[PDB]
DNA sequence: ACCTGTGACAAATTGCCCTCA
DNA sequence: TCTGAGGGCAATTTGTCACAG
DNA sequence: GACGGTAATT
DNA sequence: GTAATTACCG
């Protein structure tokens, strides 16, 4: 049974920018984190690459060009920033490599949280839908159902979704069906959803969900 | 002016393949 | 030989915007 | 490369 | 023929 994920809900709700390979990598700092200390993780490159089940050389492929892109990158929980390495990425042996994460991000990590199963989202492709799933994961029940209404201004300052996503018809086709689509073909959930509207605005989205 | 969707094009990403220390 | 670090790809997805209703 | 199987040399 | 350590090859 795959390796169960916890995290604060103020990290499913931060805004950020992530990639998929850097988000999946991101569970297992988590993962290493939270078992026991001082920030410094490490990851082999094949144990990656069997539970994605890419080949090695993908793999490395994906953990080098996600390490070299977390340079610069920023977390902000609403309305703090901070950088997630404060020291480059470095392999000590060939197929390992040691990171630095900012060990202030620590408390923001174990604390009022959400917590998913890392079976549930290692086949999704788009972020954004990684992103979704973790906010409904955020509330489901022990069953395995939910309900919640998210407000659209929210998820893009939150999900930092690209500026032409400001336009609803590219909201919908883009983003909304394709990771609802994901989320229905890739996790164990059963997902649907209505729109909440304002005059000619639409401005919540309704999402219910269901355990298969 | 506002809303919706679709058609196109570009830019990015994916799972591939090959090669050599 | 088995790893993994590189070097590439075509097909597909994602981000953007012009245009009609 | 890095590691271990296999022949080879004492 | 054996023993055992070793260069090296895959
Ligand atoms: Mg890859
Ligand atoms: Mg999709």
New binding site residues.
């Given amino acids: 049974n795959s390796p169960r994920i916890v995290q604060s809900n103020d990290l499913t709700e931060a805004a950020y920018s992530l ?3 850097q988000k999946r990598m991101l569970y297992l700092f988590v993962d290493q984190i939270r078992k026991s200390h001082d920030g410094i993780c490490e990851i ?3 144990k990656y ?1 069997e539970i ?1 089940g ?11 060009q996600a390490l070299k892109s977390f340079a610069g990158k920023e977390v902000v929980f609403y309305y703090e920033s901070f950088p997630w390495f404060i020291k480059p990425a470095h ?1 000590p ?5 040691s990171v630095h994460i900012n060990p202030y991000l620590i408390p923001f990590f174990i604390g009022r949280f959400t917590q998913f199963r890392l079976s549930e989202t290692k086949e999704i ?5 990684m992103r979704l799933y973790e906010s409904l994961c955020q509330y489901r029940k022990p069953d395995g159902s939910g309900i919640v209404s998210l407000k659209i201004d929210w998820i893009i300052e939150r999900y930092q ?5 400001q ?4 909201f ?4 909304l069906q ?2 609802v689509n ?1 989320i229905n073909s890739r996790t164990p959930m059963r997902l649907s959803y209505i729109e909440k509207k304002k005059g ?3 401005t919540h989205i309704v999402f219910s969900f269901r355990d298969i």
């Fill in positions: 990639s998929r390979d082999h490159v094949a690459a994605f890419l080949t090695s050389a993908e793999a490395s492929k994906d953990i080098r392999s042996s060939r197929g390992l490599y492709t788009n972020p954004y839908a979704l690209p500026q032409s996503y336009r609803m018809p590219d919908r086709r883009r983003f394709v990771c994901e000619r605005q639409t």
